[PDB]
Amino acid sequence: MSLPKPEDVLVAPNFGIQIDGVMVEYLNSVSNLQIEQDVIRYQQNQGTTGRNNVTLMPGVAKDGSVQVERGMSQSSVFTQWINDSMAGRMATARKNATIIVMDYEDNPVKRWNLRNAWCSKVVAGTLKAGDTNALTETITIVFEELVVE
Amino acid sequence: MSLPKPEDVLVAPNFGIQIDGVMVEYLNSVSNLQIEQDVIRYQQNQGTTGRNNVTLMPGVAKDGSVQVERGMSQSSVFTQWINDSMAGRMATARKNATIIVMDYEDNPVKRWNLRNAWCSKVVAGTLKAGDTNALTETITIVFEELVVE
Amino acid sequence: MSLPKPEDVLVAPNFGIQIDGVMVEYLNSVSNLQIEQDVIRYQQNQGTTGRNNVTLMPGVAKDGSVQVERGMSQSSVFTQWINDSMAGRMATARKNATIIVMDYEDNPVKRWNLRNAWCSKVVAGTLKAGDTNALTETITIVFEELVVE
Amino acid sequence: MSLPKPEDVLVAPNFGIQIDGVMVEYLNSVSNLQIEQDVIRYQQNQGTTGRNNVTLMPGVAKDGSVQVERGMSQSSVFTQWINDSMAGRMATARKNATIIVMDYEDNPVKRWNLRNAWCSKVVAGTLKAGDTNALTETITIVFEELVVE
Amino acid sequence: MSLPKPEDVLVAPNFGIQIDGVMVEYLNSVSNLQIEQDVIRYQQNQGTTGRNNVTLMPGVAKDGSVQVERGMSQSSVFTQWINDSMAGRMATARKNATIIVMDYEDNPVKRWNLRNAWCSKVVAGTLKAGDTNALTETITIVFEELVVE
Amino acid sequence: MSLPKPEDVLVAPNFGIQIDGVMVEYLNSVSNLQIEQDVIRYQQNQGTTGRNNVTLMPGVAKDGSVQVERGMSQSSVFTQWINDSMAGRMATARKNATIIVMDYEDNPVKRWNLRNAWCSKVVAGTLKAGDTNALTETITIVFEELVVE
Amino acid sequence: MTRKDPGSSIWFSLAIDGESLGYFNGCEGLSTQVEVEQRQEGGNNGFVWQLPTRVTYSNIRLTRPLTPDTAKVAKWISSVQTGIQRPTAQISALRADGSLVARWGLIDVLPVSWQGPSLDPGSASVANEVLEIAHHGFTD
Amino acid sequence: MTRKDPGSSIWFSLAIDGESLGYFNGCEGLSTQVEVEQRQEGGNNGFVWQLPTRVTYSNIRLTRPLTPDTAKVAKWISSVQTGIQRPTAQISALRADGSLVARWGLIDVLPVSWQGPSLDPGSASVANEVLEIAHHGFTD
Amino acid sequence: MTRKDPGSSIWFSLAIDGESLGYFNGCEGLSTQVEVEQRQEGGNNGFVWQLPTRVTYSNIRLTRPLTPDTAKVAKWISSVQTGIQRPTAQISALRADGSLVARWGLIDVLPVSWQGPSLDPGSASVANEVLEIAHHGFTD
Amino acid sequence: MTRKDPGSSIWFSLAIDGESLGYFNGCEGLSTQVEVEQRQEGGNNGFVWQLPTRVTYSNIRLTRPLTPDTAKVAKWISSVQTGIQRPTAQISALRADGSLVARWGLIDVLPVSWQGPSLDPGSASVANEVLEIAHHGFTD
Amino acid sequence: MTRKDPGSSIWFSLAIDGESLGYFNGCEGLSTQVEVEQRQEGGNNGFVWQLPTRVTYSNIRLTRPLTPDTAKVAKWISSVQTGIQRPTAQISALRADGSLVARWGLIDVLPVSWQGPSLDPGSASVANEVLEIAHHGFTD
Amino acid sequence: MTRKDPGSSIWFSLAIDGESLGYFNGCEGLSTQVEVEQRQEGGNNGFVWQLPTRVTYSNIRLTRPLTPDTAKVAKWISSVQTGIQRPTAQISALRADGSLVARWGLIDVLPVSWQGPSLDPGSASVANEVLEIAHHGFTD
């Protein structure tokens, strides 16, 4: 924003998913806008292979986007999302999602609207007795349609 | 707990299982809940290949979580579990388990209730004559149903 | 070309794609002139299996360039390019491109003309709350025919 | 076993196998008690997922051992073991084995009985002219029946 | 050669091929004279499985030896070579080749006479905007017959 | 050999092959005695697949020892060995070989007799204009019968 | 449409009525063919008339883990000497919620084949007996 | 000249008219054949005369995910007892833009087989009912 | 339920009585079918009657590692000239504990084929002679 | 010699004349066979006499991407009723220089089959219609 | 006893006597079969009687590396015109120690086929001539 | 014994004489079969007699890279209408240096088929015409 040479610097994410995924949360990543490529080996009168024609594909989606809600506090809302999906109840599990990016000052500048969220995984960090950092309750979120914007 | 920004630090494991665990249980690494996904490439009549419709799968399991009992002391209860269990005798081999997580103060906060245990492996560390650290009796407990909570 | 062997110091890129440019464009990854071989095993009357003949093949193309526009500012041309190819409209998505290499002094010396550009991928960098090194809106550009010159 | 924190230290290996041992020896490598995996996704009548049932498996043998005798002295028992197997003569090839683990003070506390040893591979270290390390006559021992205790 | 224990030095490459050479050539990092083998499990009469009999094969070529002309100067000689093989014109692309090695003092001693050069690949270095090293126009040259001498 | 703890030192290689050796010899590695295993999962009347007995094999061969002449001097002996093999002429190709391991003091103690050797790789090191180390004319030697002693 | 609810091939419920066969574990081949008789009208070239003729239902292979209740199936099969009872089976496809997608049923059944477990000391899997069911009309 | 890229094997549109079968999801085997008759000229070695004879259209296998609207196709097949209907269906191939590349139309439709879903407790997929169809001619 | 005790396909017990064939190592193809006969009612389209007639048992292929006791099998097979004997065989599947899941038996056996070892200088396996077995019924 | 002019299997030129079928993209099966007749002499064991009898030219399958000009092919195939035309084809293999290595020309063609595109929502490819071609002889 | 002497399938010994065919390198298909005859007892549903009938020995495919001594086998095969000779043959299985496990013998032999080497400029292998051999009976 | 001279399957030499076919590049299927007539001696069981009858030589498939000299083959094949010459052929196997292991020769030849190149715009290979050749016997 401020300069013609800006960078959307780090330390500025958030979300607005209806599951109360708030407060401590770091290290979301692996966002993608997948599109693969076809192959045709077209022919002509000259007999040259005619280069390599390429044509469009489906939006691959399935972008597992990994969220790391560092530290599993008394809040167990993340494990309620997956435990809901395991038995079904799509009325509450198939949640819309949004990832917010804020600029050099804490103001939103771009939003990666997520069409469908799933939360198909939840892992926990190693429980080593003698280390220093904290448990990480990493979540993997799957889509149905690709991100927008 | 103490603050709205908490972190259950790495140093708070313990295991309450019917096999008599002892003072050293130390490292404990892999623990997750996997559901997986499929693909429906449903297309309507507008001609679009449509979004990759995604539907629910079963509760993928067999997530053995490795319990590194630092020290092959005279307590051979781990190998015994493998042994009797290897020769069958599932009357004393299922042994539903539990992993306990505590705060800075040693009070349980979140417990990963298990459903069935196997102890399907037990590897000892290298025996180099001249090294420094201890001997690790790594375990590979296996589930039948996934963890709970 | 000032001296006998001054080569080309790598700090001199700039693109020339038809869509609107970018101030920074702070990386430009591998570009290739790919073409593999064939194999014949011909033997002469003498009896030797003979040197394995190697004939030719088509220029495989499909060269992917991971143009990295350091910083996702409000310039959404990159995500407008792919979102355009998601639905079609080759009239505005099949735009030929040019990569310019500049001399030790900022003058163009060699240009890699691209016969067809596609923008089949846009991937954002990880958002670690507490890290550095800004955001990278890495782009992958596909071809139809290989580069020229 | 001096105190309830024994952490049986790793620098105490030895083994009496039927052929003559060696004064110098170290690096007794991975020795485990592995079990297989049986999958039987069972279905009830609630239409539920069915927790993937896990069953019992054969104790899978062939636990490879990489004994590392420091250097090839004039002693040639190890290469006589393999040269004996490569021709036959099981009367002197299939021999029992026993890895001994010693206490913090040099007394035996736990023994890994091996039912059948084979010595299926002897490999020498590199012969670099200028290195400072020593030759290693690494052995690989396999089993017919898994270890005991 | 002056001393009684010469072993050459890495700093003595040069090559004369019918296409024009360049001033500085950083690398050439593959030079193989590969020939493969067989396996015959021949049986005599008394019963042994017999030694692993091995025989002689083609001197398999395709040992493209990647070359690194440090600096894509205005000299477009390399990209003219590949641009011929792409369109055919094998009369001028199938070039004979040589590689010269010199002593501790610059004088040829051993020459790797090639037999058929092809230049089937031209790859440029990353155009990082801020690095320090130069630009490498790496060339991959393929053979029809393996090297000589 | 002197103490009951011979740290039989890495720095003592040499070998005598009927084709003239070299005064200087940079490398020697990857020599072993390899035999594989069967897996019979036998059954009794108790039904336990209790053990998987293993049975003897051929003396698996083709142990590529890899000789590294410290430098490609004017001595073209190694490339004459392979160039002889490529055209046949087993009268000069199927050469016996013997790697010698020398005592702490430069005396022979153990000898790896190579029953039948025949070279198949004379790969050479890379040429960098600015490096420091030397040219390595790596040799890969193939066997027919495993090494003896 | 509440984001639909498309069927899948994991959730189901397979059962046979009558004799204590219990609930099975995997279906296959449920199909209804229609025999068509092709008559080539000699007057005009360009196609061959397609006319329907009868409807035939193919066999169904049902599999389940080998459990001690397999003695019931052998008793049922070997009852053909004294007469076979023909109960009414049921094949259903579900979603993870346990609700219904489309429930089929077999009007009358008849054992055809019973491929027993393939015992093997090496391969690690569950013994899967296979029961083959003859078919009749679809219930409605 | 523009780049009229050809029909990708992804974008399409499949439909059946008449009975509410809706829109399908996959097609295979759409083909027209002629039965050449070979007569070997006796006095001339060197070839065998090829003479055209009639034109025939092969069957098509249309597959869609199993949805609760599968009760219609099962009803349609079983309607042959009391009178069947041949609705007229379409098969079209499109590009990403949704324009038309080549639109074929089945002149008359007759069901032949309906391979139902293959239920399986292990395989992670989605039930795909297979509805065959008898060709009768191409529209124009 | 004691967490049940489902059958598996590793633990077993295979034996033949009579001639000292001993205990085998792997079964296959143990199966029993029914020869149904299809008759099509003329006036009632939509189904074909599935009348049940007889029952046919199929052959069994038993395999074991080649051991010096294979002379007994060749003696048994080549005894058909001077009179054969039909002992009674058993096929049982067990869980790991060594208990019983389902014990089948063969009323009367008869050799059919004996595929000997596939000798090979390269492949690293173990000789597995195969003894096919004819059948007469299940014991109860 | 000029380092020879070796054959290749990528560069080619496939065309059909006559109706505006245009240039195709992939050949297959171009083959000529004879039909030898084996008569075995009774009194001379050791061999069976081989006597040539006629030659026969096999069919050719030509494939190309599904372009909007596929309407011409269906028009050609469905012209059998009102009268067909046999144009003259060509099948030529080339080296990358664009020169000629071997040129075959089909004397008279005739459609046999047209396997249309195989539409599939999940498979990333491009539709390849297949036009089988009957044969009458090579040209010279 | 003494940790048993288990059979293996890598050590062997294959030889033909008489004509200087020498020692071979691989065997396959050594098998004996008895053609059972099935009789359906009319009045008793429940099985089909199994009755033995004759014994039949199948052919054997023996392979060896192509060696200049292949002129003998070609001469032996082409000796049918002037009278053939059938020498006894031996097939034996061995352990690594070289001790006998089970030594079979072929009473009388006869060539059936000789699949010569499959020459190929690309494939890196060794020519393996195949000598199919007839059979009469096992020796004792 | 000069460490033997074992045969191999890379070095060879394939040629046909007479018509300028030149030297080929790959062989296959070179084989001789002797038909055996089985008569079941009714008196005694345990074996079935094996008797030799005639000796038949199978076809050979020779392949080579497509070269402009393929016009000679088509002239040879299409010469049936005017007369076919049967030139002698030769198949040989050599070691690394180029000495002889076993040289076979076909006394009389005859074309049976010529499968031309399989042109493909994507598959990177070299066109390999296949000339199937008849046979009359080995030479000595």
Measure the end-to-end span of chain G: 27 Å
Strands across the major sheet of chain G, in which order?
1-5-6
The DSSP helix count of chain G reads 1
Which strand-content bin applies to the residues of chain A? 15-25%
Mind summarizing the main beta sheet of chain G?
3 strands, antiparallel
Radius of gyration from the alpha-carbon trace of chain G, in angstroms: 20 Å
Number of helices of chain A: 2
Q: What overall form of chain G do the CA principal axes indicate?
A: extended
In total, how many beta strands of chain G? 8
- Secondary-structure element string of chain A: EEHHEEEE
**Residue fraction in strands of chain G:** 35-45%
Write down the overall geometry of chain A.
Answer: extended
| Percent of residues in helices of chain G | under 10%
End-to-end span of chain A in angstroms? 18 Å
Oligomeric form = part of a larger assembly
Reading side by side through the largest sheet of chain A, how are the strands ordered? 1-3-4
Number of strands of chain A: 6
Q: What helical percentage do the residues of chain A reach?
A: 10-25%
* Biggest interface between chains: A-B, 43 and 42 residues
Task: Give a short account of the largest sheet of chain A.
Answer: 3 strands, antiparallel
Can you walk me through this structure?
The structure is cut from a larger assembly and holds six copies of chain A (149 residues) and six copies of chain G (140 residues). Chain A starts with 12 loop residues before the first strand and ends in an 8-residue tail after the last strand. Chain A has two helices and six strands, in the order E-E-H-H-E-E-E-E. Chain A is of the alpha+beta class. In chain A, a hairpin with a 5-residue loop joins strand 3 and strand 4. In chain A, the strands form two sheets. Chain A has a three-stranded antiparallel sheet with strand order 1-3-4. Chain A has a three-stranded antiparallel sheet with strand order 2-6-5, with helices on one face. The longest helix of chain A has 11 residues, at 77-87. Chain G is mainly β and 140 residues long. Chain G is 5% helix and 39% strand. Chain G is built from one helix and eight strands; from the N terminus they run ββββαββββ. Chain G has one helix at residues 71-77; strands at 12-15, 31-39, 49-57, 60-65, 89-94, 100-106, 110-115, 128-134. In chain G, the strands form three sheets. In chain G, strands 1-5-6 form a three-stranded antiparallel sheet, with no helix packed on it. A three-stranded antiparallel sheet of chain G has the order 4-8-7, with helices on one face. A two-stranded antiparallel sheet of chain G has the order 2-3. In chain G, strand 5 (89-94) and strand 6 (100-106) form a beta hairpin. The longest helix of chain G is centred in the middle third of the chain and has 7 residues, at 71-77. Chain G is extended. The A-H interface holds A 38, 40, 53, 55-58 and H 5-6, 8, 10, 95-96. Chains A, B, C, D, E, F: This is Phage tail protein. Chains A, B, C, D, E, F: GO terms for molecular function: structural molecule activity. Chains A, B, C, D, E, F: InterPro entries: CHP02241 (IPR011747), Phage_T4_Gp19 (IPR010667). Chains G, H, I, J, K, L: InterPro entries: CHP02241, Phage_T4_Gp19. Chains G, H, I, J, K, L: This is Phage tail protein. Chains G, H, I, J, K, L: Pfam families: Phage_T4_gp19.
